[PDB]
A paper describes a structure:
In Gram-positive bacteria, nitrogen homeostasis is controlled by an operon encoding glutamine synthetase (GS), a dodecameric machine that assimilates ammonium into glutamine, and the GlnR repressor. GS generates glutamine from glutamate, ATP, and ammonium by a mechanism that involves the initial phosphorylation of the γ-carboxyl group of glutamate by ATP and the subsequent incorporation of ammonium. The structures show FBI-GS binds the GlnR C-terminal domain within its active-site cavity, juxtaposing two GlnR monomers to form a DNA-binding-competent GlnR dimer.
These structures revealed that, like the Bs apo GS, the Lm, Sa, and most of the Pp apo GS states are dodecamers. Interestingly, overlays of the individual GS subunits show that the apo GS subunits are similar to those in the FBI-GS-GlnR complexes (rmsds of 0.5–0.8 Å for overlay of 400 corresponding Cα atoms between GS proteins). In this conformation, key active site residues are not properly positioned for catalysis. In particular, the Arg62 side chain is rotated into the active site preventing the proper positioning of the catalytic Asp50´ side chain and Arg316, which assists in catalysis, is moved out of the active site. In fact, the electron density for the active site regions of the apo GS structures are poorly defined indicating flexibility in these regions. Thus, our structural analyses indicate that GS enzymes from low G + C Gram-positive bacteria adopt two distinct states, the active, TS conformation (herein termed the “A” state) and the conformation adopted by apo GS/FBI-GS-GlnR, termed the “I” or inhibited state.
Numbering used by the authors:
A (entry chain J), B (entry chain B), C (entry chain A): 4 to 58, 67 to 82, 87 to 370, 385 to 444
The structure:
Amino acid sequence: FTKEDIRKFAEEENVRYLRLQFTDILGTIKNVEVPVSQLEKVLDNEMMFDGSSIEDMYLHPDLDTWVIFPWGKVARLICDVYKTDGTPFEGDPRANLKRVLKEMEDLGFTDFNLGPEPEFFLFKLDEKGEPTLELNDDGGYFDLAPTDLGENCRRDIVLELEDMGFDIEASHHEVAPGQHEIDFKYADAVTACDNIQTFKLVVKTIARKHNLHATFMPKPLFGVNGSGMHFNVSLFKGKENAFFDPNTEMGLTETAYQFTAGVLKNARGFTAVCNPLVNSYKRLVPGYEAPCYIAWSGKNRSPLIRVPSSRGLSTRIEVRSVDPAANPYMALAAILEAGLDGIKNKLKVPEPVNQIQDLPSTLYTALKAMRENEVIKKALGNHIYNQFINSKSIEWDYYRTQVSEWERDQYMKQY
Amino acid sequence: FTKEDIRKFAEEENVRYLRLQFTDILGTIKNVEVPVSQLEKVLDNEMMFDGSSIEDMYLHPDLDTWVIFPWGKVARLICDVYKTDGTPFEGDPRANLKRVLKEMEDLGFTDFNLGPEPEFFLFKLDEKGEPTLELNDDGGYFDLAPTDLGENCRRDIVLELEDMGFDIEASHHEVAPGQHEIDFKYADAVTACDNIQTFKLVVKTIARKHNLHATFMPKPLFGVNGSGMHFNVSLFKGKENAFFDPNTEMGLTETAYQFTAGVLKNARGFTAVCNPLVNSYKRLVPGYEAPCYIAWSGKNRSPLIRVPSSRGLSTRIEVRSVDPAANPYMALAAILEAGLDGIKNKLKVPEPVNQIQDLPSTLYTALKAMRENEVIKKALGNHIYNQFINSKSIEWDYYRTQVSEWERDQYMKQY
Amino acid sequence: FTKEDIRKFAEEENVRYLRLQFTDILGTIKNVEVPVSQLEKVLDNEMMFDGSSIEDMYLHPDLDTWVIFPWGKVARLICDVYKTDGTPFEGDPRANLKRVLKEMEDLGFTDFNLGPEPEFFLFKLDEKGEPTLELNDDGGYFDLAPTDLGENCRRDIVLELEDMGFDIEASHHEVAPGQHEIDFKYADAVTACDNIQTFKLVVKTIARKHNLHATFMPKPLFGVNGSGMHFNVSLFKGKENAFFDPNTEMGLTETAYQFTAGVLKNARGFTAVCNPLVNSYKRLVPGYEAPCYIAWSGKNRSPLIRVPSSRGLSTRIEVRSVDPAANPYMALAAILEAGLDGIKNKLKVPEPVNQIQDLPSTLYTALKAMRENEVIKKALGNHIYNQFINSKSIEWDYYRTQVSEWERDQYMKQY
């Protein structure tokens, strides 16, 4: 898309307002709404926001991200954050991912695809409009109505996403009660992260329209399956998958093996980025279909890395520890950098486990492991690395001092 | 606009009623509604009201302020208050600002632009229609729905303002929960103050339609960021900005430096006018993004005066201590006179603070400082000066004797 | 009293427990209860407490303060606070008053009497036992039952105080509804301050037995008379009043005039100590029988200093600005030092006002005036002076940022 294309779209679609939206370090999408009479100012990269209020900057819209919300008509553009000197801000996760991809392109790889699959819960709202603790239904995996009561809301979400240009693959009820999954096809790295960001807000808006609250919190309830955001990744060097070997019986190139070796070797280091909440490690517990051991397998369900049986152009590596609360840009950049480190150091792959280190058990331990990894620092840059560590340390210190109801139930009558 | 233009508008738009509205000393907009059959009497400056009931007078409409409320169709005219002898009333803030501008024009300056940016809170209404203490949402800076629940109300306010001829620039959620900001571009001094007055009433009218209460109180809640009304001001002598120097690397003329020197030197004096409430000084406290130190900077966030990095015709000076509860005419006249004092006395500018007196801490201290400044007395004239001081002194005396709940919580059990 | 007297009292009265009680800088009485089996340890000045938890110390009981609470039987001793080296702690208000009296004795004055008269309100308790905002009755000055419903509680307080060795003089309903006053005769400075401390706790304990809450808060409610703790002061040099002149028609010595001159001259300085609360200056407002002007009179009701018409050995000077929330030791020491300053500088007295500086209007202004006065610093010593200033500054900073209900009632709908 060019400026002329955007102008033509604005005139012919009668777009009245523009939403310039971007993402902070915590993965929260931030936006400012602007009347279409400021279209020329927006297209000249002259829009300005504060920056000090977000975890003197400029907004540079990415014109390929133009899309109209089908709910005054509003269109949106996903913008990169630049400084006053015309250079991209080093603390912007999206510009970070772009430059990581640019560094990848020097190794001969021309593309990096991401197929995500986030899961979410639906909770009922009260009369005041606040979410309650009761799920929308008590359905199970692949359940249908009236056992699956989220069928109408899920259908409306799919309908709204299709109007916005998504390529939806499947939709179904998930294992936990009130848990749902909508699948969309892979895209390029940047547009896949944009798809995740847009998908979360579309899901939340349409769920609110249905008197429901949608949350991507990893483990909202104890004793119930958590939500994951498995990352399917594949490398390409020119209209061809770099992971697929049409000669060996297994069908994986040496590049695919080195990528897996690098991801496995650096998995402990990027866990904090891929699992950024304190709640994220209540999901990484045994017995709930969540990965907590660093291993890979081609024929098995719950190692850290699973290589699906499909081959050809669909040959991919699935990292299963990513949760929907993670920042897609930072997590994808960390995974890509770990894989590229494995590629360029020619690491040998441990034997697949078909029947072994451990992921960090808490956010504090993951932060400790993140400070000791050199690959994650290079993946994130100095600014994002330092801000993430400082904010997560403050968050953990806030969490560390709380007294929970579990403690008052076990103690206070026994002691 | 002429009389013929107004008559043509009344016939062709089928206007049924006229709202002749003006502003008192406290910034409250007052009006009387008149059937369109009295249009000739209105245009002949023969409208009369009491005057003794407002903090034997004639209304003189300003025909350029014609606008129709898009919600019997009603149009409005902003009127000046005249005495029975045909001379403007010395206690009318709008006529005061007009004559201050007339005095400024004798110095060679032909224009004075004001770009304001007021902020407001939205509170939920109860069943009886009274505002509660519960904010409309719990969103943050640049937040979006469903975290930003004021999106629809803000969009309707913007839509309603655009029909009235405003040029809206941006709208977004503000830092505090339930705090919102809608930005409109600068205009001439008188019409900018008229824009502020119209903006407040449009916001308050559209909020009621959404079962919400809009308030421009500076600090409605403790522990929460307050609302400001930063004043962006620039001087012109004929289709060219007098603050812009395209020779120096900094890009500011000597005139811009003397204006800043005058505003800084007289900043203590006009604080009471720019912060006229007792609540205004609960916002002027450290740690909440509010100015409390009399200093200027070009590259910094929170001095009293901020000079934005933009240059050319958009070279401005931002006075950041003005709150939305201030009377726009009186505050703008005070700031203009303070700047012109430095212009005509060639005051030298203190060095910018990039890493120092203090603003008055209470309304009583601000009133004490106002009685000791000659520039504010010359800016407001004798009548407005005396009435403002008397009314604010009475208000402070009423506030001083109250016993708050904080006092009964700290004491009453300890003593 | 000697150690043998205390042992005899403990054996013959069958005292089971001892309360070693002392006063912190804020006037709050602190105590620890000890079984009578530790009587020898208590009498050997070997009792220890923390000190860091109170606004490694030793307790030295003052044996003359022995008294038994008539409500296991408990007696108490008022203790001085000493350091580990056997010297009195410089931050103890009682030891401060003792050394100020010792310094006074070098001037030839052998005694210093104080007649206090604190006033208190009575508030009804709810079912949970918390105080409410409704007064016990709606009686007035010198009112009787059933208009005065505090008659029984006041009688029980008087009965309990008489068993404890008080010499009660009068008890009556006060001007404000629910306000009461019980008078006891003067004593020496240290024992008068001990009487005030004991009186407050006895009143608060007995009121609780009547399902009432007793408070010595200066101004608990707006629009209603506040509570004062007038200090009646007289100097003696040997079984004779130094203020009484049997030859002059008025009957006041030059010493009495110089004492008044000193107190008037230093009145602004010690106001913060005598009025230590933020609420204290809601009482110091015109129209409620409270002093706010620094002047003296012999025949008038409301100057700052009143000299009662009685002469002989009962010739006294009444300072009327002290409220019952003040620390009696610190306020008495400040007043004594202020008077002695005039005594030793031979200050001339301003003419009595029978029909003029102004007391500080807020706690902040009183603290500012405290830092500029050397007599108060000499009276309190360095440690108490600095601790009081720091704590009151923090308290004022906490109060300054609150948003009261008055502000939300005046504003929030007007703006």
